[PDB]
Amino acid sequence: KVSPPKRAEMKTSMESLIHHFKLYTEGYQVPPGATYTAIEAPKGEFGVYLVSDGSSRPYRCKIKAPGFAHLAGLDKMSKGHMLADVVAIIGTQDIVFGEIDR
């Protein structure tokens, strides 16, 4: 009811095929509620705030990126410095921009 069964079990068993059909069309239903999960990404604390209404699609998914707060803190880091020091700061904050912009 959450993870799809094996293909042999799908092709030889009824309820495995039913579960495969419903998982790969509708998907598993998450019980309603909210959570915040923080995982030590190499760039920092990658967090996700997930809100589910009880359906098979999430109601809300906020993506906390460490690089977003780091680039918010870029301005304080670059006080009293030059252009090469700015590019050094950009490098050492370990910035990728997909997770920042979302």
């Binding site: 069309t25 509708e26 239903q29 967090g47 098979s56 809300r60 906020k62 918010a72």
Partner: protein, 208 residues
Amino acid sequence: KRPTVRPRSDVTHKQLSAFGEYVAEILPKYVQQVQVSCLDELEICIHPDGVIPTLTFLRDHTNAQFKSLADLTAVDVPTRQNRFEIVYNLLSLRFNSRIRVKTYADELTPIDSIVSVHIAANWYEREVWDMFGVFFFNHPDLRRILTDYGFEGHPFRKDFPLTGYVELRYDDEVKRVVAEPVELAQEFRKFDLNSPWEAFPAYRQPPE
């Protein structure tokens, strides 16, 4: 014992319940609700007037020490009067804990800004204003941070369409990148992936 179900520890639940009673009796002026989830997460729902005292107390109190802002988030629920629910996820490194502070707002009642409490709230509230249209009082520079310049409307709202209203293309008469009303070669096919049978009896609303 059971390899499928997640193990549950009651000591974290009791500790978070005790701290919830602690915060609720310290701040009865603003705190509206205190709950502990089954996933061992503590949520305190406060009045919008109590954002500054609640955040300052949780940051600076000896027993709280929630000195780190994990994130600041808005959730659009367009069926209640104050549709934007503002969520503050905070982390205490001293006690190794995580707390969630919730409050409410609508399109016309702004809430106070906590740049004076946490500095990450600057960009986080800029994102929240840009995506949901919740104004923030006494902000240093509140403006758009992720949408394009001159973008009309707040795109993370519920009533905003997924594809949007306007689209860009290069026009050769004016030699510019111009904006025109949205028109798709293939429309996004919405799917009704909602089963007509109740999945969770524990979350059954009583009939109206």
